[PDB]
Copies of this chain bind each other. A is one copy, B any other.
Amino acid sequence: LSPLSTHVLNAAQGVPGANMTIVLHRLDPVSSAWNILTTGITNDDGRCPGLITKENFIAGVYKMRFETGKYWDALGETCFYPYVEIVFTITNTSQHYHVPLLLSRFSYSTTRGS
């Protein structure tokens, strides 16, 4: 029921990115600061249900921060990116938004899904 979802895939190992800290932020429309909305941790399928509610899902500029450095380092390995932040604009509120992350130690990618 969260209108915003995510999926973290460990591309190097071909398994879900489990136990990754994710932080969701929305741009404050007065200060130009990022306000924290949620912190979450991906489950064993690399997902994080409950990121936002329908009511709090308003048009805005959002930021999802993936704690890639802490993730890779609890697997005992270095990462080129200490974290990854994906910034994106939500204009149409009646759509579902899936903002996933494909990660190795030295690359990543993302796409918009529905």
Tell me the A66-114 residues at the B interface (CB within 8 Å).
69, 78-89, 102, 104-114
How far in angstroms is the closest Cβ of chain B from A2? 18
CB contact between A114 and one of B14, B108, B109 (< 8 Å): that residue = B14
- CB <8 Å contact, A102 and B111: yes
A37 at the interface (CB under 8 A from B): no
A97 to B, closest residue via Cβ: B80
- CB <8 Å contact, A81 and B87: yes
CB contact between A109 and one of B13, B14, B78, B108 (< 8 Å): that residue = B108
- CB <8 Å contact, B85 and A89: no
A69 to B, closest residue via Cβ: B89
